[PDB]
Symmetry: D2
Subunit: 105 residues, 4 copies
């Protein structure tokens, strides 16, 4: 029934925006700034991603603005206007230019 999956590597434009909903389900919305083609150049891409629950909490606690992340999910369309968003499936900080102490839970 058709589907989509995407992987992107980019930087958070700002610190993780935490909130909750009527359930008590943790929601974070953040944008990844990715610029294609380090040599040459592209035209910056801004993708909005949404991550939910446990994962959302951990994201908020761990990542900050400018952070270089690796994101996976599907594409989703927002609502007379449409916008493409990412239903984050997994996300983590790229260890290409950084280190991290990891804490299991």
């Amino acid at each position: 029934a058709g589907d989509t999956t995407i992987t992107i590597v980019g930087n958070l434009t700002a610190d993780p925006e935490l909130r909750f909903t009527s359930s008590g389900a943790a929601v974070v919305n953040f944008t990844v700034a990715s610029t294609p083609r380090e040599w040459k150049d592209g035209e910056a891409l801004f993708l909005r991603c949404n991550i939910w629950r446990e994962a959302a909490e951990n994201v908020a606690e761990s990542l900050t603005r400018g952070a270089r992340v690796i994101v996976t999910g599907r594409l989703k369309q927002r609502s007379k206007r449409t916008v493409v968003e990412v239903e984050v499936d997994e996300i983590g900080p790229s260890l290409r230019y950084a280190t991290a102490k990891v804490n299991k839970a």
Copy 2:
């Protein structure tokens, strides 16, 4: 220096419209209607992704595909300026033989 590659499986919303550009390069723009099936089964809302395929690959698509067609599309996400949108820079495309057959003609 991030980057972003995507793969989608959908149906063309309409026959491929072939066009061109200042250089000569054939250009085809089309939309893929993809409807993800969720956990609960449930068929969540339809997605409409615009895809651009250029040069020869574009020509072949225009010749081969028609509306309704179930396709398999790979590429990268790109933004065009508003005042914006997300589009696919198709890298490869082809008709999913999940519900059909095809007579393939190399060049």
Copy 3:
């Protein structure tokens, strides 16, 4: 859990191997030759079943350029090992260098 999905583009090394089971279920096994002209060819084995399998067998032939999606799987030939295969989910002929007449079912 874990994401083991993959998409690949290559050519079929040979005409697809149709075949059947006690059930009467169709199984095709074929190999995709992909070269990452920086290279060194990669040979992935792919298995596709039922209806889709039948369609492939009828449509595709050796040398064919295809677009394949599925998950990596690991199979047994464990002597003195394990091999990686693709559980094809969707497959089509890449229109990059060819045309095709579609005919839905």
Copy 4:
């Protein structure tokens, strides 16, 4: 011209193994244990574990060695290569492009360079 990029999510089977080469250029080899969760009747079912060998080079390799440990849940992107390991057997590996720790079950203190 072929496309062999892949993304996987799994857990390191063991602590990252750092080593170098003729150059002094760093190299890490590790394995990711991924187990897909297959659906039939329905009801979840796991399914046979996959073990993919990944190689990551240079500064990224150093960072990995310093940050990650065995059991760690990672997100790896890269390309599949074939090498030559019945006498000369062949084995599919990942040329890691980008890697990081999945924040799905954990937090991390990130520190740039």
